[PDB]
């Protein structure tokens, strides 16, 4: 796993499962479309766009998703599949997010970036 935080503070680690195409990545102001599955360290699944059967779209770099996501997706290329290990300070913090996410929980997300546009 590679630490992708600005100062490498250990808050967001990334492991590429499948390399994407090229080197171009989505930037702030773009709308990305992805599929994802989120689980706790013990495997407990708390969210998934795949189970809903609908790709998830959001505007990158505007704080519309947890900090670990704005950081992680910005490092992905088209078609890439990556696993992010997100410490709570880049996730839901000390309060957590009921009903399944306790405070201080490290989140594991597997994300597949399909495309993006302005």
UniProtKB/TrEMBL annotation:
Source domain of life: Eukaryota
Record has Amino-acid biosynthesis as a keyword: no
Keywords noted in UniProt: Isomerase, Repeat, Rotamase, TPR repeat
Gene Ontology molecular function, alphabetical: Hsp90 protein binding; peptidyl-prolyl cis-trans isomerase activity
Protein name as it appears in the record: peptidylprolyl isomerase
Record has Isomerase as a keyword: yes
Domain PPIase FKBP-type stretches: 29-117
Organism: Caenorhabditis elegans
